[PDB]
Amino acid sequence: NGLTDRDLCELNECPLDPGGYFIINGSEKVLIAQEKMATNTVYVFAKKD
Amino acid sequence: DLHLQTGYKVERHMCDGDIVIFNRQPTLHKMSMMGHRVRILPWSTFRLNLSVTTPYNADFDGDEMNLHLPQSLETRAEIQELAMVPRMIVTPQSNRPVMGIVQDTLTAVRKFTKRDVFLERGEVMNLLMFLSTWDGKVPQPAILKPRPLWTGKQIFSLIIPGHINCIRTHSTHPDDEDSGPYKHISPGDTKVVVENGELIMGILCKKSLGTSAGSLVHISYLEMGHDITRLFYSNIQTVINNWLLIEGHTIGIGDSIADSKTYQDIQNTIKKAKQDVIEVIEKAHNNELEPTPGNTLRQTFENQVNRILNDARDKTGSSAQKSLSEYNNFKSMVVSGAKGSKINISQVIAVVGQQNVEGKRIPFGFKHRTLPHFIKDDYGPESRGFVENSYLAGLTPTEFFFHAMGGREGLIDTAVKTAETGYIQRRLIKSMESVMVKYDATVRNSINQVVQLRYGEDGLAGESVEFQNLATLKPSNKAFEKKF
Amino acid sequence: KQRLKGKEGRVRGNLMGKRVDFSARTVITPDPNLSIDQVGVPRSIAANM
Amino acid sequence: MIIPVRCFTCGKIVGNKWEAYLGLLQAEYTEGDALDALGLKRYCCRRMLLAHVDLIEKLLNYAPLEK
Amino acid sequence: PYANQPTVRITELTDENVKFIIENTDLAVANSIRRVFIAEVPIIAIDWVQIDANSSVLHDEFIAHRLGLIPLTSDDIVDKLQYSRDCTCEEFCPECSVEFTLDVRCNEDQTRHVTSRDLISNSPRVIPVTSDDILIVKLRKGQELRLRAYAKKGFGKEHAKWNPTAGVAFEYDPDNALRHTVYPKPEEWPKSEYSELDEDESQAPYDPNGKPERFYYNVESCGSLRPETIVLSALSGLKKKLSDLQTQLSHEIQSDV
Amino acid sequence: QANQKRITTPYMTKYERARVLGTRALQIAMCAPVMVELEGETDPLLIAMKELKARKIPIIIRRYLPDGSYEDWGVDELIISD
Amino acid sequence: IFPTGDSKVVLPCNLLRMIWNAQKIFHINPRLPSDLHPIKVVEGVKELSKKLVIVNGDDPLSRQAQENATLLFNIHLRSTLCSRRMAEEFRLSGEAFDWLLGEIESKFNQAIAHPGEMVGALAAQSLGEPATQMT
Amino acid sequence: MIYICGECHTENEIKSRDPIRCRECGYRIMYKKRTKRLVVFDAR
Amino acid sequence: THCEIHPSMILGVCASIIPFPDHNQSPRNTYQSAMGKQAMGVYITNFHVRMDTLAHVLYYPQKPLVTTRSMEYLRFRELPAGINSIVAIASYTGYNQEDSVIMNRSAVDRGFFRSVFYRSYKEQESKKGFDQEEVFEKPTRETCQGMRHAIYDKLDDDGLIAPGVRVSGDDVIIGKTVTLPTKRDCSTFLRTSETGIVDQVMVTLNQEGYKFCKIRVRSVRIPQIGDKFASRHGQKGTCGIQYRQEDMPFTCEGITPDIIINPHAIPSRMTIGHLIECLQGKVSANKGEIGDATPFNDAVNVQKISNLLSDYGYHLRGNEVLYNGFTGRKITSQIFIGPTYYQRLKHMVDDKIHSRARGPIQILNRQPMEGRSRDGGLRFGEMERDCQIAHGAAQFLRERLFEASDPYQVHVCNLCGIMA
Amino acid sequence: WGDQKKAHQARAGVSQVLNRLTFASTLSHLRRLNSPIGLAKPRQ
Amino acid sequence: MNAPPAFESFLLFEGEKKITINKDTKVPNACLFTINKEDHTLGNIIKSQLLKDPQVLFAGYKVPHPLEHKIIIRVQTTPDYSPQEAFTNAITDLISELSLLEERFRVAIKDKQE
RNA sequence: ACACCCAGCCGCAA
Ligand SMILES: [Mg+2]
Ligand SMILES: [Zn+2]
Ligand SMILES: [Zn+2]
Ligand SMILES: [Zn+2]
Ligand SMILES: [Zn+2]
């Protein structure tokens, strides 16, 4: 964080890389957002059967 | 230890001329595994003839097929005598030739069969060189003086084998020609007639060389045999491709632009349709739209709106087609029947048309509106999915989103329905795995339960049946007595 | 019982339809210069098989 | 990564015009005038120069693993 | 029955492009002449590269490919040097190839450009086109590049790097007279450079007795071979091909008889 | 059964065509006698075709009726479909 | 049997095309009179219909079964080969008629169901094929 | 068998089956030099 | 109450690079948006420092002539994923029929779409036993239980293949032998059909403190006639055949197309935006700036592009007269030429190719194994046996499912049916 | 996603391997959603 | 893997001949030349030159397959003029044409150079 | 005379 282009290049890290991923055992893992029903909101549904 | 005595077996490599079988999953119908003769070409990719692209429900864009090699003389013999694609041109599923001239050949066949086409001497020699069954005698040119010109129909007549007798109607056949005079002249050069294995008149298209009953290839198979049909297919493809090298085909923006008068007429039609739907929705708001019998007020309002919009899109498509130029490649591609349809021409030129999801128009996802940009409680065409603009003209964002919804519906149903059809066809084939015909010509189950006394109530296989007309049921009593 | 069950199982995954030798797979591209019966096969599959 | 030596379509020499192209651009000239001055009449070479992006400047920023 | 009498006129002879007009000739002859211009004109180019040491950011195959595409001036010794395959020479000798050595090391903060000028030849006749300069690779401080390369004799059929012409332009019948191409809307099309119609007229009238003739060429060299000796070499190569066919056909027909 | 009462289609069909051609080709491929004169043919399949056209197959087809009784047919009484 | 006036029906041999082939193979001139006794046609078609057998036998039950199986082809054949129709529309000659009868016999015999066909699998796969196009 | 390390680039001679470092920077990343053995590269 | 920033912003990352997405049909926008993930290029600048399995990189990427305003903000310009190439949408000899492509062998020889295939392998010093410890060392022919005919002398004394040495298929790269409970060669081998060259070799200490090595093997991949290609409008295609420069057609100005797709690809799958891109690319290349092709723009339409092209000396609809490459005769029609963006895809025929002939055999089923990497066979699925039943080829089906797969003999008693 | 021993009730598919075929691929993978569904209504 | 060597496109390895003659049996006085390791560059020339001969009926060429470097040329003459001699005469006229073209190009270049 | 054990999970091609 906070490093400019020069330090990132000197540090063997791509300036253009957006980041946003973890590194576990050398494999770059990225979390994916998961949808779920909104909490604390009364709904109404009509089950057909 | 390399000395070979009689009785040894040597595992040679796959030499040319050997027999193999292909397969493309999903293997939907029995056509998807035919036998082929092997040929050795450079590079690292299979290479098969184009017309086979239809039997295997395949397109040559990343598709990959299997290749099984038989490993016994008995196996090779049966595959040669049963599954070799020359002997299995016509499928018994619908007693029509699943094989068909397709893509550049078919369009080039159309442009090569027109009356206007003519060939100089050297071009005719070049075309004849690509044939294989040619007897070696250059036919008399249709034109002698001032200079020799051959007609494409004459070269095609050379291509036809034996003495075939076929009569088919071109796609753009005017219905008035049959009743009126010039019935056998056909000023539009419709009414394809093949006499004594020579092409006499008419342009060829999907309805004559395509995968249709009573097609020219169908009659070729039924009459001459199966090898001659293979030569027919190969000759057509080779010679037409090598003539297309001279003629050439293309498609571009010039084929999508229409005349300014056409644009003005199209805009006028769209404006009138929008005004009419404004009128009918005004009537609905003021409560004078009398409900259709058996239908709800909303139901009949939707039906009337859909009727108006469909009339508008049909009129726009007809106007675009009328203004569509003869040299326009879109018209050639559609009328030939290679790919595309007149509806696609209408969408490209005039109007994309109404976009609908699950049959109905765009649903009201928000509070009684389709998107935030439209006023609440609107049933106008622009605000419910209708796409006034065309692809060439470009789509505005809202209609672009609605078209995206329509395309997503296409993707979703085409992608989910394979699981159901895969289960139905597996259940059917598993049920009917054992039913077959014994040598009493009685169809029987696995445990010898007579299912049918004779196959198809007549004992006739499906590969040798044709469409015919009784010519005795329809005529009246007076006409019957007169004619018999 | 789960070994003998449906897809990815004994009866349907190893007996009714089974993996077999003497086979090949690769992409397909057009070639209008071969007859209908013919087909191109490259030298690698021809040699190995 | 770096300006290709030969135009893909025809084959006119192109690798020797990248530096001149940048020099002409620096001297207040527009792209069209610069390409005309460099003699690339055919448009395949024009897009060969114009559409190329040189990553090699970004690549040299990394120190070599030898010395 | 006998051959026709071609005639040639030259309209421009700059240092790198040549325009000439060939009249009274079959279309096939002209088409084959252009094909030989772009396929079967001998030229010297790099084909065998040995990378002694490459610390550049670019990899060995990249540098080898780029060196291969570099043109080499071979106005003279294309005829003298024999093909490596034909030379009884094992591997490579100076009689059938030209040897190249490249040695550049960057030892300063400023970026070093490994231009084609850095290439050093043995025979002074064969050198890159420098008598701007073609760039090969850019090097940071401490990035060496040492390699040796041999240049063979080849023509365009083997590989594009042996293609001498930049791009050959071949146009015949500028104002469409034989209707070899049909314009649906002729007025919309620009008139060709070699046209001879007025502004009002769109196309020449139909010529049923016409035949293609008066072909226009615009052969442009890549700087390796002069753009006029290239045509002579092309014609000589076609003549030699036909003479080889003569010898082979004579041998075959005598053997049959 | 005897010579009489022989009821079955006398058209030697495509399935038995394939079987007979394959088996005869295999037999000749194992150095078996040839039934007809041959003029410079070596492929077993082609010679099998030619000798079938000569109608001299040394094989009798046994046909299984659904009931269980067999019915033997020689090739030379059968007429070729082609 | 056929309500709704559906005259389109599937039969083995394309009789019209066969007659046309006979015409243009024997160069028969429709203008000139032909030499074809109508009784020759009558017993010709009758003998042909006798030689087309689906249910081979001689007992009354087998004969009735054969008649029922071949009724549609026989009726279409008689309709197309009627005496007046041959006299007027087609105008074939005697050798033309003999060749037509022989070719019809050969084609029908070729089109007969071959024992051993796996009719069940063929039917299941053929009827399952359009299911992928029903979308 | 000379190894080149991460950043300070010393061709340290190890040949001793010890934990891999260099006496200059100590970074625990090592690379090995391009082989002296030649290899042809076709320019095709 | 509110006003949109810009309507085009609805598009996603991979869908934003599509030029004129509105003019295309939405299904093909979807398909292209799927491909943009697979469109190779300079994926990250520091690729040579990194090393990971299945990493590609392209030689000569180019920012597209027909750009989109959003693309500059996705940083696509810095890291393109394709080349602008002259395209001729026309029928030809027939090797582009259906969805296929004809390419330029001469241009391919000049570096057109030539790309690298970096592949990285790793091996570990996972000591399990107390004397059964593996070590990196050059195996000897007699001291190792595992002895193949593979070429072993290429390795150094450490047992790691030196960088910069050509390695063929099925070669040893890491010589590691496990001591027996004298030794056993548990060494990894380079898999089938790569013929690459090892470039970089690494040695390190793993997390648990044992020696750990990685090596990277690269191999240039000149496009053969099997490689999947697609435009920015969902134009799935493969290289049917490569023609040299003298075989393909050529304009009166000497321009020769790099790629020739078939007109059949346009009408059925309406992608008029492809033609719009071609025209805009032509006018942009002629003029000198990068063509603005943001999705929803009333300023830019086909008519103004046509007028600019006409002003610059071409057919106002983008067509051009092309001469037959073989004959030299003018083509009767007039082909549609112009540049456009094309992307090489991850799918390569050299990777998808596969064959099997009595190779290795599964332990449990005693049948051919899974995958080409394991040299396994192909499945003869249930729908295939059904097809062969429909054919009626009995003994073909028999050998396919019994003899070619796994023949086996058993002894069974006659009184009882139990295995004996 | 969850405790190791309770993989049955643990939702799967989270933390996919980052795709690195192209910069566009990386950005698309970073900005991605996913539904927990294994009928066409949820998928339209 | 299977990419053929580039030099293969024109070189003749030991085991084949440049020319083979086949007498077509379909029509009298016909030949089937089978020039090997060539392409359209020669086939087009040969077809054009033969077609100019007044006393030859048929003349054409085809490549059986673009990947395979082979061409087949068929020539049919009147029943007093062997196809082989027609081929030879066409080639000789071609050689004279190309030599004349080279000479006149030399003259044009010399005249242009001052 | 070859060497790599399997289950699960995920992406992706037609
Ligand atoms: Mg597909
Ligand atoms: Zn160029
Ligand atoms: Zn030498
Ligand atoms: Zn250090
Ligand atoms: Zn027992």
Residue G123 buriedness (CB in 10 A; 0-12 / 13-18 / 19+): buried
Question: Measured between alpha carbons, how far is B329 from E90 in angstroms, rounded to an integer?
Answer: 59
Domain that holds residue D52: 1-67
In the stretch 363-402 of chain I, residues with CB closer than 8 A to chain G read 386-387, 389-390, 392
Identify residue K52 by its one-letter amino acid code: K
Closest CA to B232 of B132, B300, B339: B132
Question: Measured between alpha carbons, how far is I134 from I125 in angstroms, rounded to an integer?
Answer: 7
Cis peptide before B146 (omega within 30 of 0): yes
In the stretch 228-247 of chain B, residues with CB closer than 8 A to chain I read 237, 241-242, 244-247
Number of Cβ within a 10 Å radius of residue D57: 11
Is residue I226 less than 8 Å (CB to CB) from chain H?
no
SS (H, E, C) I12-25: CHHHHCCCCCCCEC
Q: Mention every residue, 6+ apart, whose C-beta is less than 8 A from residue B234.
A: B49, B132, C34, C35, C36
User: Looking at strand L, which nucleotides approach a protein CB closer than 7 A?
Assistant: 1-7, 9-14
DSSP state, I29? H
**In B394-430, which positions are buried (b, 16+ CB within 10 angstroms) versus exposed (e)?**
bbbbbbbbbbbbbbbbebeeeeeeeeebbeebbebbe
Q: Is B311 annotated as a binding residue?
A: no
Question: Measured between alpha carbons, how far is B371 from B442 in angstroms, rounded to an integer?
Answer: 64
B68 backbone dihedrals φ, ψ, rounded to 5°: -95, 130
Give the residue from chain B lying closest to F9, CA to CA: B439
Question: Measured between alpha carbons, how far is G3 from F62 in angstroms, rounded to an integer?
Answer: 46
Identify residue E20 by its one-letter amino acid code: F
Structure tokens of B483? 């004619």
Residue C14, CA distances (Å) to B26, B434, I380, I407 in order = 19, 20, 10, 13
What Å resolution does this PDB entry report?
Answer: 3.4
Selected catalytic residue, list I22, I52, I99, I258? I99
In the stretch 183-202 of chain B, residues with CB closer than 8 A to chain E read none
Cβ B30 vs Cβ G122: under 8 Å: yes
Contact list in I for residue H3 (CB cut-off 8 A) is 203
Closest CA to E37 of E200, E195, E219: E219
B240 CA distance to ligand 1 middle (Å): 25
Domain that holds residue H12: 1-44
Three-state DSSP class for residue B123: helix
Closest CA to B273 of B172, B351, B364, B362: B351
Could you say which architecture CATH assigns to the domain E1-42+161-257? Answer: 2-Layer Sandwich (3.30)
Distance, Å, I148 CA → L3 C1': 8
Q: Mention every residue, 6+ apart, whose C-beta is less than 8 A from residue K53.
A: E1, K59, K86, K89, K90
I415 CA distance to ligand 5 middle (Å): 5
Question: Measured between alpha carbons, how far is I392 from I386 in angstroms, rounded to an integer?
Answer: 10
Question: Measured between alpha carbons, how far is B44 from I223 in angstroms, rounded to an integer?
Answer: 11
Judge: G118–I387 Cβ closer than 8 Å, yes or no. no
Cβ B44 vs Cβ B51: under 8 Å: no
Chain I: closest CA distance from residue C40 (Å):
12
Give the residue from chain I lying closest to J19, CA to CA: I37
Question: Measured between alpha carbons, how far is F70 from F61 in angstroms, rounded to an integer?
Answer: 10
Beta-sheet pairing, I335-344 with I228-231: antiparallel
Judge: F25–B77 Cβ closer than 8 Å, yes or no. yes
Closest CA to B79 of C24, I391, G121: I391
Structure tokens of I77? 């310009």
CA atoms within 13 A on the CB side of E5: 0
Structure tokens of F70? 């067999």
Torsion of the alpha carbons at A8, A13, A14 and A17, rounded to the nearest 10: -100
Question: Measured between alpha carbons, how far is E71 from D6 in angstroms, rounded to an integer?
Answer: 9
Residue H11: which CATH number? 2.20.28.30
Question: Measured between alpha carbons, how far is G46 from B234 in angstroms, rounded to an integer?
Answer: 43
Domain that holds residue K108: 1-114
Distance, Å, B46 CA → L5 C1': 35
Question: Measured between alpha carbons, how far is I84 from D43 in angstroms, rounded to an integer?
Answer: 12
Query: Can you spell out the DSSP letters for I36-93?
Result: HHHB-S---TTTTT---SSEEEESS-B--SEE-GGGGTTTTTTS---EEEEEEEB--S
What are the residues with a C-beta under 7 Å from any atom of nucleic chain L? B 25-26, 58-59, 61-63; I 34-35, 37-38, 145-149, 184-186, 189, 236, 347, 360, 362-364, 374-375; J 12-13, 16-17, 19
Number of Cβ within a 10 Å radius of residue B343: 13
When computed from its CA atoms, the radius of gyration of chain G, rounded to whole angstroms, is 18
CA B270 to chain centre: 32
Give the residue from chain I lying closest to E59, CA to CA: I199
Residue G43 buriedness (CB in 10 A; 0-12 / 13-18 / 19+): exposed
Structure tokens of I420? 């004996």
CA I198 to chain centre: 20
Give the residue from chain I lying closest to K3, CA to CA: I224
Task: Could you please state the CATH topology (level 3) that the domain comprising F1-82 is classified under.
Answer: Eukaryotic RPB6 RNA polymerase subunit (3.90.940)
Give the helix ranges, DSSP H, for chain E: 27-39, 60-69, 229-256
Cβ B214 vs Cβ B466: under 8 Å: yes
Judge: F15–G109 Cβ closer than 8 Å, yes or no. no
Cβ D20 vs Cβ D35: under 8 Å: no
Residue B147, CA distances (Å) to B137, E178, E210, F38, I195 in order = 19, 14, 12, 52, 60
Three-state DSSP class for residue I117: strand
Question: Measured between alpha carbons, how far is I285 from D32 in angstroms, rounded to an integer?
Answer: 9
The dihedral built from the CA positions of residue I27, I28, I31 and I33, taken in this order, carries a sign that is negative
Cβ E14 vs Cβ E127: under 8 Å: no
Cβ I196 vs Cβ I313: under 8 Å: no
Return contacts of I376-380, CB within 8 angstroms, 24+ apart: I376/C19, I377/C19, I377/C20, I377/C21, I377/C22, I377/C23, I377/I405, I378/B66, I378/C19, I378/C20, I378/C23, I378/C24, I378/C25, I378/I354, I379/C17, I379/C18, I379/C19, I379/C20, I380/B68, I380/C17, I380/C18, I380/C19, I380/C20, I380/I405
Judge: F45–B444 Cβ closer than 8 Å, yes or no. no
Q: Number of folded domains in chain H?
A: 1
Mark residue B322 as left, alpha or beta (left: phi above 0; alpha: psi -120 to 50; beta: remaining).
alpha
Helix axes K40-52, E27-39, angle to 10 degrees: 160
Task: Respond yes or no: is residue I99 known to be catalytic.
Answer: yes
Judge: C41–B22 Cβ closer than 8 Å, yes or no. no
Contact list in H for residue I156 (CB cut-off 8 A) is 1
Distance, Å, A22 CA → L5 C1': 31
Structure tokens of K49? 């030159």
Cβ B379 vs Cβ B386: under 8 Å: no
Domain ranges of chain F: 1-82
CA I92 to chain centre: 25
Structure tokens of B218? 């169908």
CA I372 to chain centre: 16
Chain D to chain I Cβ contacts (< 8 Å): 97
Q: Mention every residue, 6+ apart, whose C-beta is less than 8 A from residue G39.
A: none
Among the partner-chain residues K2, K64, K65, the one whose CB lies closest to the CB of C43 is K2
Residue K102: which CATH number? 3.30.1360.10
Question: Measured between alpha carbons, how far is I406 from J41 in angstroms, rounded to an integer?
Answer: 46
Residue D58: which CATH number? 1.10.10.60
Question: Measured between alpha carbons, how far is B163 from B220 in angstroms, rounded to an integer?
Answer: 9
Residue F71, CA distances (Å) to B440, B444, E229, F7, F22 in order = 12, 19, 86, 9, 22
Distance, Å, I256 CA → L7 C1': 55
The dihedral built from the CA positions of residue B424, B426, B431 and B436, taken in this order, carries a sign that is positive
Chain B: closest CA distance from residue G91 (Å):
15
Report which residue is nearest nucleotide L12 when distances run from CA to C1'.
Answer: I38
When computed from its CA atoms, the radius of gyration of chain C, rounded to whole angstroms, is 17
Number of Cβ within a 10 Å radius of residue H42: 13
Judge: I205–H20 Cβ closer than 8 Å, yes or no. yes
Contact list in A for residue D61 (CB cut-off 8 A) is 5-6, 9-10
Contact list in E for residue D9 (CB cut-off 8 A) is 167
Longest CA–CA separation in chain D, Å: 44
Domain ranges of chain E: 1-42+161-257, 43-160
Structure tokens of I202? 């690494």
Question: Measured between alpha carbons, how far is I42 from A17 in angstroms, rounded to an integer?
Answer: 12
**Strand ranges inside B306-440, DSSP E:** 436-437
Q: Mention every residue, 6+ apart, whose C-beta is less than 8 A from residue B458.
A: G54, G69, G70, G72, G73
Report which residue is nearest nucleotide L8 when distances run from CA to C1'.
Answer: J7
Structure tokens of B267? 């805009």
This structure was determined by cryo-EM
Q: Mention every residue, 6+ apart, whose C-beta is less than 8 A from residue I238.
A: B60, B61, B62, C27, C29, I99, I100, I101, I225, I226, I227, I228, I229
Cβ I267 vs Cβ I274: under 8 Å: no
Contact list in I for residue A12 (CB cut-off 8 A) is 46, 49
Structure tokens of B51? 């017309």
CA atoms within 13 A on the CB side of I280: 22
E72 CA distance to ligand 2 middle (Å): 19
Q: After which residues is chain E broken (C to N over 2.5 A)?
A: 131
Among the partner-chain residues B146, B254, B327, the one whose CB lies closest to the CB of E208 is B146
Contact list in A for residue D62 (CB cut-off 8 A) is 9, 12
Beta-sheet pairing, H3-5 with C18-20: unpaired
Q: Does CATH number 3.40.50.970 belong to domain E43-160?
A: no
